[PDB]
Amino acid sequence: SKGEELFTGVVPILVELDGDVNGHKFSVSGEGEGDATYGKLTLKFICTTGKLPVPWPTLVTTLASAVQCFSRYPDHMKQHDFFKSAMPEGYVQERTISFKDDGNYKTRAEVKFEGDTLVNRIELKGIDFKEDGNILGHKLEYNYNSHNVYITADKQKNGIKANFKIRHNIEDGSVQLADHYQQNTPIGDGPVLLPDNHYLSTQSALSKDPNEKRDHMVLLEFVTAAGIT
């Protein structure tokens, strides 16, 4: 597509999130870069309101949803890249993240170019969380397992849908499932690529900046599109 030409090099990324989980209000700011040619994303997130009331791993898919734009689509699959085709005008995203035996996050995001920078503005609303649950009780390990994002076309809405499962590791050795349902529609009136069924193979690594005293998260992600031969 035409929008793919904007991703041939290193693109700066800005992430801004406003959240409310069970009345606990917070804000997160993120800075980094993505290099789609290698399906690479590097981002550092900082909680600007103080301490994050939810564990950092629970916010990775939301805070770094722009990784979908940096997915390396193999040459034979390039006509299936919705994300880049929606650029520079961008897309609006909505998700419902359901934590098994706990609450849910409902998100609304806009991913678009502001000059040569890819900006992701997000609003997160979390309800029905248990006080001593895995989320509000901070019982999740600071790590991330590899996963696949299953994409299907939504022809009538001129966009896409996505479904995936995240398995957060609990400190006792168990797993906290987070079911994701996603919908994306373009902001602009220009033509976008409506894909055939495929998936985004994701690999993530969470770390800390040794010199950072604020509540933060450093993320390194690698994403490759697959599913079509």
Q: What's 151's domain CATH number?
A: 2.40.155.10
Sequential DSSP letters for 152-204: EEEGGGTEEEEEEEEEEEBTTS-EEEEEEEEEEEESSSS----PPSEEEEEEE
Cβ contact 29:119 at 8 Å: no
Cβ contact 89:185 at 8 Å: no
Half-sphere exposure of 151 (CA within 13 A, CB side): 24
Rounded Cα gap, residues 223 and 111, in angstroms = 17
Indicate if the alpha-carbon torsion angle 183, 217, 121, 19 is positive or negative. positive
State how many domains the chain has.
Answer: 1
Q: Strand pairing partners for 85?
A: none
3-class DSSP assignment, residue 3? helix
Cβ contact 72:225 at 8 Å: yes
The coordinates were experimentally obtained by: X-ray
Largest CA distance in the chain: 50
Q: Which two tokens stand for residue 164?
A: 């995936």
Header resolution in angstroms: 1.5
Expressed as residue numbers, the domain containing 93 is 1-229
Cβ contact 45:216 at 8 Å: yes
Provide φ and ψ at 151, rounded to 5°: -105, 135
The H or E element that residue 26 is part of is: strand 24-35
Residue 165's CB is within 10 A of a number of other CB atoms, namely 12
Provide φ and ψ at 171, rounded to 5°: -60, -25
Of 153, 160, 152, 157, the C-alpha closest to 199 is 152
Rounded Cα gap, residues 106 and 216, in angstroms = 22
Of 227, 224, 154, 186, the C-alpha closest to 85 is 186
Rounded Cα gap, residues 97 and 65, in angstroms = 13
Sequential DSSP letters for 107-125: EEEEEEEETTEEEEEEEEE
Sequential DSSP letters for 39-85: TEEEEEEEETTSS-SS-GGGGHHHHTGGGGTT-B--GGGGGG-HHHH
